[PDB]
């Protein structure tokens, strides 16, 4: 019954569900019950047009955001038509019959199926089209070229191989749903005319010269008043008085505490932050016990205002007891109507052009005090340039309820903005729940499932910035994960991979419980993925701890011996790939598995593809399992590279990049996708500057030589511009790879935000004066055009990095690290001045 489901949920999260039942925090138990509404809404969407809607949840169409094909992709077609191969399995003997078609690139799946039926019968709608070799279906009326698989075949010049499948054969393999409910289911702040005061009672569990408590009232990372310290001494029993009146406290105000140690040398020993208002909008009052957190490396200040809000779950840590005033009644933050009343009671063409100039500045551009006052005075004209909302929100004095009431009214009527601009309002700079709610509404209105999958790692990270467990953002993400299994799969893994981090364990564990309770039979597939990953984690841990010093041959004897055990073989075969759940990982080809001699000794694993038409895609799936490397920098880099490639493709610049798959599975463990038929530059050379070009010529003889040199040039141009803008380091010949067809790509992105002679000879087709050929001038023009196209999209890139500021990545800890892109992109210069800077760097 439910005891079975709770056991399976526990195995998926890596935490027994009864641990959440034991938590007495009312916010936790209210979240567990209230999130079930989102679960029921999603389950209802899945049964609305059953069984078609159930099939589209499990197998959502993998399409691009727009049906429009860029001019250079349309040119690859034959008079706007594509040649596709439709296969039909005609049992007995499982015989494969192919029928080749030449149809319009925008033909919907049913038109393609009808043309195949016509060609077959020359010797109605109870069929569906599947991609040969993987579990990807064409279940929706999109034009064929919009499907990522088809669009990928047009570019690349490959032939689409689709399979005509009986609609009944798919629907019968979909499970029967249940999603049954679990067993676990005043005065106004503005009338308190006193300044804020908080009593610091005593600190337990605090085993140099003296100790004191450092405190501050903050809104985001910005202090609303000066910091106040207790006396150096531990019992203080002292009331701390702040230079801020209670009615001027914004809704997202937080108390940031610290226990510091003392030409005096100061150092934080522990920190803790408390929301001044709880999840029910009640101002905190009475006694409270805050368990503090250890100081994170590289703090550079006495307080941590960006850090997680709430008491440390480990109650055997420094515990600071605090007392808040009680004003005889429960104090609440005023209703929207009350705020509206106070906002009302609070009240040139050269100026319109000055607002337009400020509006075009990037998120990290400095806005002077004169400019902040200028923007705020024209706050009413600003509703006509909606892209200026983030700049106007920074101009508001958040410690003044008169300005904040007026800002709330402007936000309540603000025109919707594009998702990439609404995402800037979801970083740590904008804590206000009305600002954050506006941003989420822009995402619900305009974010496609495609763009949501693309920006999933920033949206899962910005969940950590929410003040409360139940919020608009988490409800949006969970609804999208519970209505699109491809989004849900990555949503599950992005959360699970952070369960080891205790500052987020509770939030992410509760969110994972809701997801597992409502995802349906996919939980059984997720448990197989989790079980295979645990066997690999334990195995690689035994290798890196016990058999660490033994030889590679002795380690391989142990790996084969461990992997041949029944328990291990069953766990490592017949499960979906966490890198791409559309790929089934059948039988382990142990003869092809090897312990690599690369850093941290990763495992190169090879599994058969059990698809009946595996030969039309890939017969074997090769994945690297790594233990010891933080795959988060690689994830972020590969996401940026994919975004840069789309910016170039859509602007008509055909620069082909290779953002191979890379999923973090937990604490410094992950999977990396093996790009088939690839070799490092060092391998090509060790099997002189003219060696590389010679290897490419031996592999590509004839007309296919021109294609390989062109592809090499384009891919090389994209990676020179990308590595430049991002400041990617350690670009030696073992981190740069090349494919049989000339495609160049980089690997291992351990360094970010800080052209060999062999490539120039390949680009110039063999010439000795390579830097003087016309091919080098054409390659140089590609770089300049690629550089300027990305510079036009700088606000997107600055925002995608800014959302990663609180991930804990050593390379991105502050806005000074993101400022590296402001220098390479030369955002403080003109388009002509930036191109000349880039040209000087290239020359
Ligand atoms: N973090 C990180 N990322 C990638 C690697 C790595 C090392 C060796 N080979 C590959 N390749 C094989 C060819 O396909 C592309 C992936 N990757 C290592 N560490």
**CATH number of the domain bearing residue 597:** 3.30.1010.10
Question: What is the rounded distance in angstroms from the CA atom of residue 67 to the CA atom of residue 146?
Answer: 5
Question: What is the rounded distance in angstroms from the CA atom of residue 36 to the CA atom of residue 478?
Answer: 11
Shared domain check, 203 and 219: yes
Buried/exposed code over 350-374 (b: 16+ C-beta within 10 A; e: otherwise): eeeeebeebbebebbeeeeeebbeb
> Is residue 132 in some structural domain?
no
How much helix, strand and coil, in percent to the nearest 5, is found in the chain? 45, 20, 35
How large is the C-alpha radius of gyration of the chain?
Answer: 29
Shared domain check, 513 and 388: yes
Question: What is the rounded distance in angstroms from the CA atom of residue 661 to the CA atom of residue 580?
Answer: 8
Q: Provide the token pair at 723.
A: 């590595």
Collapse the DSSP code of 556 into the 3-class scheme (helix H, G, I; strand E, B; otherwise coil) and give the result.
helix
Q: Say how many Å lie between the CA of residue 672 and the centre of ligand 1.
A: 6
Shared domain check, 349 and 320: no
Number of domains in the chain: 4
Shared domain check, 752 and 705: yes
Q: If we measure between CA atoms, which residue out of 2, 32, 17, 60 comes closest to residue 489? A: 60
Shared domain check, 729 and 640: no
> Is residue 75 in some structural domain?
no
292 Cβ contact list (under 8 Å, min separation 6): 257, 259, 270, 271, 272, 312, 317, 318, 319, 320
Report how far apart, in Å, the C-alpha atoms of 583 and of each of 137, 167, 197, 352, 607 are: 13, 21, 59, 55, 11
Cβ contact 273:322 at 8 Å: no
Question: What is the rounded distance in angstroms from the CA atom of residue 101 to the CA atom of residue 652?
Answer: 28
- Per DSSP, 483 falls in state T
Shared domain check, 714 and 583: no
Cis peptide leading into residue 51 (ω within 30°): yes
Q: Say how many Å lie between the CA of residue 300 and the centre of ligand 1.
A: 34
> Is residue 109 in some structural domain?
no
324 Cβ contact list (under 8 Å, min separation 6): 198, 199, 283, 284, 285, 286, 287, 288
Beta strands in 121-160 (DSSP E): 127-131
Q: Say how many Å lie between the CA of residue 747 and the centre of ligand 1.
A: 6
Shared domain check, 477 and 467: yes
747 lines ligand 1 (CB under 6 A): yes
Q: Which helix (H) or strand (E) holds 562?
A: helix 552-563
Q: Which of 612, 634, 666 is the last residue of a domain?
A: 666
Question: What is the rounded distance in angstroms from the CA atom of residue 442 to the CA atom of residue 434?
Answer: 13
Q: Which of 272, 307, 332 is the last residue of a domain?
A: 332
Q: Provide the token pair at 133.
A: 């070799």
Shared domain check, 657 and 732: yes
CATH of the domain at 822: 1.10.1070.11
> Is residue 741 in some structural domain?
yes
Question: What is the rounded distance in angstroms from the CA atom of residue 617 to the CA atom of residue 603?
Answer: 24
Q: Which helix (H) or strand (E) holds 236?
A: strand 235-245
344 Cβ contact list (under 8 Å, min separation 6): none
Ligand 1: atom nearest CA of 634 is 1
Experimental determination technique: X-ray
Collapse the DSSP code of 102 into the 3-class scheme (helix H, G, I; strand E, B; otherwise coil) and give the result.
strand
> Is residue 121 in some structural domain?
no
Q: If we measure between CA atoms, which residue out of 477, 461, 508, 510 comes closest to residue 28? A: 510
Ligand 1: atom nearest CA of 674 is 14
Maximal CA-CA distance, the chain: 96
- Per DSSP, 424 falls in state G
CATH of the domain at 323: 2.60.40.150
248 lines ligand 1 (CB under 6 A): no
Q: Provide the token pair at 477.
A: 């993400």
For 690, other C-beta atoms within 10 Å of its C-beta total 12
Question: What is the rounded distance in angstroms from the CA atom of residue 505 to the CA atom of residue 645?
Answer: 35
Q: Which helix (H) or strand (E) holds 638?
A: helix 632-650
660 lines ligand 1 (CB under 6 A): yes
Cis peptide leading into residue 280 (ω within 30°): no
Shared domain check, 612 and 490: no
Shared domain check, 532 and 504: no
Number of H-type helices and E-type strands within the chain: 33, 25
Cβ contact 484:60 at 8 Å: yes
Shared domain check, 310 and 432: no
Q: Which of 492, 522, 552 is the last residue of a domain?
A: 522
> Is residue 59 in some structural domain?
no
Collapse the DSSP code of 668 into the 3-class scheme (helix H, G, I; strand E, B; otherwise coil) and give the result.
coil
Shared domain check, 479 and 589: no
Domain carrying residue 387: 336-522
Ligand 1 pocket: which of 596, 747, 752, 811 to mutate (most atoms within 8 A of CB):
747
> Is residue 262 in some structural domain?
yes
Ligand 1 pocket: which of 673, 715, 748, 752 to mutate (most atoms within 8 A of CB):
748
> Is residue 388 in some structural domain?
yes
Question: What is the rounded distance in angstroms from the CA atom of residue 693 to the CA atom of residue 659?
Answer: 24
């Amino acid at each position: 019954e439910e005891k079975i489901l709770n056991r399976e949920i526990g195995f998926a999260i890596g935490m027994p569900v009864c641990e959440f039942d034991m938590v007495k925090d009312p916010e936790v138990q209210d979240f567990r019950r209230n999130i079930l509404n989102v679960c029921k809404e999603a389950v209802d969407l899945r049964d609305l047009n059953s069984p078609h809607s159930r099939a589209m949840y499990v197998y959502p169409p993998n399409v691009e955001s727009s049906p429009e094909l860029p001019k250079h992709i349309y040119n690859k077609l034959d008079k706007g038509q594509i040649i596709v191969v439709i296969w039909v399995i005609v049992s007995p003997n499982n015989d494969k019959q192919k029928y080749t078609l030449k149809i319009n690139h925008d033909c919907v799946p049913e038109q393609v199926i009808a043309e195949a039926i016509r060609k077959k019968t020359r010797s109605q709608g109870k069929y569906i089209l599947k991609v040969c070799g993987c579990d990807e279906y064409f279940l929706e009326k999109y034009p064929l070229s919009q499907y990522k698989y088809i669009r990928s075949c047009i570019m690349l010049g490959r032939m689409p191989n689709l399979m005509l499948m009986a609609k009944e054969s798919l629907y019968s393999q979909l499970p029967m749903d249940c999603f049954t409910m679990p067993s676990y289911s005043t005065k106004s702040l503005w009338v308190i005319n006193s300044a804020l005061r908080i009593k610091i009672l005593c600190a337990t569990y605090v085993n140099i010269d003296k100790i004191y408590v450092r405190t501050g009232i903050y809104h985001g990372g910005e202090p609303l008043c000066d910091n106040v310290n207790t006396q150096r001494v531990p019992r203080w029993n002292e009331w701390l008085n702040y230079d801020i009146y209670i009615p001027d406290l914004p809704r997202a105000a937080r108390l940031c505490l610290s226990i510091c140690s003392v030409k005096e040398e100061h150092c934080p020993l522990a920190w803790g932050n408390i929301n001044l208002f709880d999840y029910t909008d009640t101002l905190v009052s009475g006694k409270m016990a805050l368990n503090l957190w250890p100081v994170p490396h590289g703090l550079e200040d006495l307080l941590n205002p960006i850090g997680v809000t709430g008491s440390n779950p480990n109650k055997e840590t420094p515990c600071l007891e605090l007392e808040f005033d009680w004003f005889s009644s429960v104090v609440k933050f005023p209703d929207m109507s009350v705020i509206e009343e106070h906002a009302n009671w609070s009240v040139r063409e050269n100026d319109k052009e000055q607002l337009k100039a400020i509006s075009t500045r990037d998120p990290l551009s400095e806005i002077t005090e004169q400019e902040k006052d200028f923007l705020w005075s024209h706050r009413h004209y600003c509703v006509t340039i909606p892209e200026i909302l983030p700049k106007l929100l920074l101009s508001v004095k958040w410690n003044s309820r008169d300005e904040v009431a007026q800002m709330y009214c402007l936000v309540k009527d603000w025109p919707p903005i594009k998702p990439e601009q609404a995402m800037e309002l979801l970083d740590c700079n904008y804590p206000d729940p009305m600002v954050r709610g506006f941003a989420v509404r822009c995402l619900e209105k305009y974010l496609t499932d495609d763009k949501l999958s693309q920006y999933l790692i920033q949206l899962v990270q910005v969940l950590k910035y929410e003040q409360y467990l139940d919020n608009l953002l988490v409800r949006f993400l969970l609804k999208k994960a519970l209505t699109n299994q491809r989004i849900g799969h990555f949503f599950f893994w992005h959360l699970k991979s952070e369960m080891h981090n205790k500052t987020v364990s509770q939030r992410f564990g509760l969110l994972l419980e809701s997801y597992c309770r409502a995802c349906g039979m996919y939980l059984k597939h997720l448990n197989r993925q989790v079980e295979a990953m645990e066997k690999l984690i334990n195995l690689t841990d035994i290798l890196k701890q016990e058999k660490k010093d033994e030889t590679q041959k002795v380690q391989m004897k142990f790996l084969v011996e461990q992997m041949r055990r029944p328990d291990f073989m069953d766990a490592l075969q017949g499960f979906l790939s966490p890198l791409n759940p559309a790929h089934q990982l059948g039988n382990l080809r142990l003869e092809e598995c090897r312990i690599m001699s690369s850093a941290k000794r990763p495992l190169w694993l090879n599994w058969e593809n059990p698809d009946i038409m595996s030969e039309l895609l890939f017969q074997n799936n090769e994945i690297i399992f790594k233990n010891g490397d933080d795959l988060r920098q690689d994830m972020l880099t590969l996401q940026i590279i994919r975004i840069m490639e789309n910016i170039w493709q859509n602007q008509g610049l055909d620069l082909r990049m290779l953002p191979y798959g890379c999923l973090s599975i937990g604490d410094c463990v992950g999977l990396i996708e093996v790009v088939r038929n690839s070799h490092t530059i060092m391998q090509i050379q060790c099997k002189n500057s003219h060696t590389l070009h010679q290897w490419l010529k031996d592999k590509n003889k004839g007309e296919i030589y021109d294609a390989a040199i062109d592809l090499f040039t384009r891919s090389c141009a994209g990676y020179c511009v990308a590595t430049f803008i991002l400041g990617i380091g350690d670009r030696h010949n073992s981190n740069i790879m090349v494919k049989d067809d000339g495609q160049l790509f980089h690997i291992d992105f351990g360094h970010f935000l800080d052209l060999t002679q062999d490539f120039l000879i390949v680009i110039s087709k063999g010439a000795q004066e390579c830097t003087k050929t016309r091919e080098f001038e054409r390659f140089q023009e590609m770089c300049y055009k690629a550089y300027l196209a990305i510079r036009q999209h700088a606000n997107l890139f600055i925002n995608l990095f800014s959302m990663m500021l609180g991930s804990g990545m050593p390379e991105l800890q502050s806005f000074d690290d993101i400022a590296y892109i402001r220098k390479t992109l030369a955002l403080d210069k003109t388009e002509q001045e930036a191109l000349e800077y880039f040209m000087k760097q290239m020359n």
